[PDB]
């Protein structure tokens, strides 16, 4: 039994959420914001990521250099990331260095200079990042996957934004974005590890009290996405490994089917030829793939957003003459979620998940990420007891029902990168989304 996550609000509507662990000596405090790239329009796409680069480029008090020094003198580090729906800024420190770190985070969020000179300098750094993501193949694949699945919609946009916008982002647009979006009712100050809740609340009252409140305060994790079955092929014969993602429209955080989709994902599961145990996994797809050397790896995923999701699999393979078999066998394994799954597979996957959802939470950063994610998507921390009950409620009948509505004979978004000559056209892939024998 984990210690209780305490939650308080301020007057502006900032949530403070903390989970203390008197066994560790380090703390992670940070701010989780319910805002990300999805909050931009087409003209200011890239702003949120731009701001992340400038948040560390100096404030009204501390210059860029002073900032660097202040953090170095703390001992820990700061980190930030921007996603489609979420922005995180956190500081890992020592137990008694928490007041410094909260003060620095409050400073970089509220009181950033955003000086024209620095905007101009980062505009080159970010421009170079456009031509170096190209190497991170999984990320390239997933970025195209969102672009095609949510064609011409806000979720379909990249985080970095187009080259054109990077050249035209001004301090004015940056200021406007963080004033409209980084509001107190959309922010959660999270502390995990060696933090006292009451101490953290006092620090919030001291530093985050003059945060803007939004005009219309909706609850945390409040959202219209129209999935497009489609494919992007980025053939590159010079690459040795093919990277393929297949996805269907999945489930939102607050779907009734959220846990059902996780169990279904666990029935297929993950595989990696480099891991010793992977040849012995119970998953049927794992067995087919390992026996036939069809793939180096596959990773099932179920990404959620506030109002939609993507559920699918990411495969990598050097076996370029049997990509057809890899895709064929994968989709026939999905078919069986509709036609064949019994309590056998369902109870096995529930067992694996009941632990997996707790095992993820190792160190203070993972705990803080869990509190922050849940508070900004569901509006509360879900206790392990509730999670265990929701998983227990998933029956074989629920999985079959869900798969038959979500996977069976549905349109897919498909992205292939690399030597994918052997990947058949869209129709033949999509035809494997059903079985004529059933």
């Amino acid at each position: 039994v984990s210690p209780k996550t305490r939650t308080s609000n301020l007057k502006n509507g900032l949530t403070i959420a903390s989970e203390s662990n008197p066994l560790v000596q380090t703390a992670t405090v940070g701010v989780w914001i319910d805002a990300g790239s999805r909050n931009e329009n087409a003209y200011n796409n890239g702003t949120a990521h731009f701001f992340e680069h400038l948040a560390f480029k100096g404030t009204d008090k501390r210059s860029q250099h002073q900032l660097e020094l202040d953090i170095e003198n703390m001992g820990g580090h700061l980190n930030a990331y921007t996603s489609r729906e979420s922005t995180v800024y956190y500081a890992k420190s020592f137990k008694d260095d928490v007041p410094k770190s909260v003060e620095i985070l409050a400073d970089i969020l509220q009181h950033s200079k955003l000086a024209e000179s620095a905007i101009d300098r980062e505009r080159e750094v970010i421009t170079r990042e456009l031509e170096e993501v190209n190497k991170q193949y999984e990320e390239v694949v997933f970025d195209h996957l969102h672009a095609t699945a949510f064609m011409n919609q806000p979720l379909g946009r990249t985080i970095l934004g187009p080259r054109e916008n990077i050249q035209t982002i001004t301090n004015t647009e940056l200021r406007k974005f963080i004033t409209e979006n980084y509001t107190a009712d959309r922010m959660v100050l999270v502390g995990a590890g060696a933090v006292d809740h009451d101490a953290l609340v006092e620090l919030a009252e001291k530093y985050f009290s003059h945060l803007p409140s939004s005009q219309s305060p909706v609850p945390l994790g409040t959202p219209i996405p129209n999935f497009v079955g489609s494919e992007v092929r980025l053939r590159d014969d010079t690459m040795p490994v093919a990277h393929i993602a297949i996805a269907v429209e999945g489930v939102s955080w607050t779907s009734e089917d959220y846990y059902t989709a996780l169990v279904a994902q666990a029935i297929i599961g993950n595989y990696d030829r480099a891991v010793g145990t992977s040849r012995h996994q119970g998953s049927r797809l794992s067995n087919i793939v390992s026996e036939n050397n069809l793939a180096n790896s596959f990773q099932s995923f179920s990404t959620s957003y506030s109002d939609t999701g993507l559920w699918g699999i990411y495969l990598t393979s050097e076996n370029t003459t049997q990509i057809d078999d890899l895709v064929h066998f994968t989709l026939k394994e999905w078919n069986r979620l509709s036609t064949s799954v019994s309590n056998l597979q369902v109870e096995r996957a529930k067992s694996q998940l009941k632990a997996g959802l707790l095992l993820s939470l190792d160190g203070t950063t993972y705990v803080a990420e869990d509190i922050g994610r849940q508070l900004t998507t569901l509006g509360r921390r879900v206790t392990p007891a509730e999670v265990e009950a929701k998983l227990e409620a998933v029956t074989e009948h629920d999985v079959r029902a869900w798969a038959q509505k979500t996977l069976y004979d549905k349109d897919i978004a498909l992205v292939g990168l690399g030597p994918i000559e052997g990947l058949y056209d869209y129709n033949r892939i999509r035809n494997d989304m059903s079985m004529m024998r059933w």
Binding site: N152, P162, V228
Partner: peptide, 19 residues
């Protein structure tokens, strides 16, 4: 003409109620 994340225009053919 350059960015591969800017999906070409398919609006002439996309059905609104496709799902």
């Amino acid at each position: 003409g350059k960015s591969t994340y800017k999906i070409p225009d398919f609006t002439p053919y996309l059905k609104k109620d496709r799902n």
